[PDB]
């Protein structure tokens, strides 16, 4: 059978249909046989109802790519209530699993996220604010607002 042979034998056996597809592409698709056999394999997998492998192939051929955007991963983390530790756990898992750094690790996710929190964008107010510190880049404050902690007064 064809799939058990080397390149030499399969060329020797398919030469006829190779010339057939070459001349059909030259007559209709400009002689670019690679895109023609790509589309034909895609359609033959579409008919075989194995959409999954054909879609993975189109992800290989001019596909969106392996990398996941760090922001989207931060999302899928928060939207799912997962940990910090557990995130890193499954991260190292998939990392050593299939050859790629599919998720970003923690610290880069943290860095990428720190802009999405409050206190990152610079701005102004016209006129300036009423009795408000013009400091902007600040993040999370403690709510007591400098409540003098001395026991003598109200706790």
Q: CA 90, CA 106: separation in Å to the nearest integer?
A: 11
Which one-letter DSSP state was computed for residue 144?
T
Q: CA 127, CA 153: separation in Å to the nearest integer?
A: 37
Nearest residue (CB) to its own copies, 26 versus 115: 26
Interacting residues with its own copies (CB under 8 A): 1-3, 7, 10-11, 13-14, 16-18, 20-21, 24-25, 28-30, 32-41, 43-46, 48, 52-53, 55-57, 59-61, 63-69, 72, 75-76, 79-83, 86, 89-90, 92-102
Tell the smallest beta-carbon distance from residue 52 to its own copies (Å).
6
Burial class (CB in 10 A: 0-12, 13-18, 19+), 89: exposed
Nearest residue (CB) to its own copies, 30 versus 119: 30
Q: How far apart are the first and last CA of the chain?
A: 86
Nearest residue (CB) to its own copies, 13 versus 114: 13
């Amino acid at each position: 059978h064809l799939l058990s042979l080397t390149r030499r034998a399969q060329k020797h056996r398919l030469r006829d249909l190779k010339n057939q597809v070459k001349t059909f592409a030259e007559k209709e698709e400009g002689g670019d046989v690679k895109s023609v056999c790509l589309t034909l394999f895609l359609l033959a997998l579409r008919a075989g109802n194995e959409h999954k492998q054909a879609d993975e192939l189109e992800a290989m051929m001019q596909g969106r790519g392996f990398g996941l955007h760090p922001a989207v991963c931060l999302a899928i983390r928060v939207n799912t209530f997962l940990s910090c530790s557990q995130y890193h756990k499954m991260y190292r898992t998939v990392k050593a699993t299939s050859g790629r750094q599919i998720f970003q690790p923690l610290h880069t996710l943290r860095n990428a996220e720190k802009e999405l929190l409050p206190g990152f964008h610079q701005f102004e107010w016209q006129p300036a604010l009423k009795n408000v510190s013009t400091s902007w880049d600040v993040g999370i404050i403690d709510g007591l607002s400098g409540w003098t902690v001395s026991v003598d007064d109200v706790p």
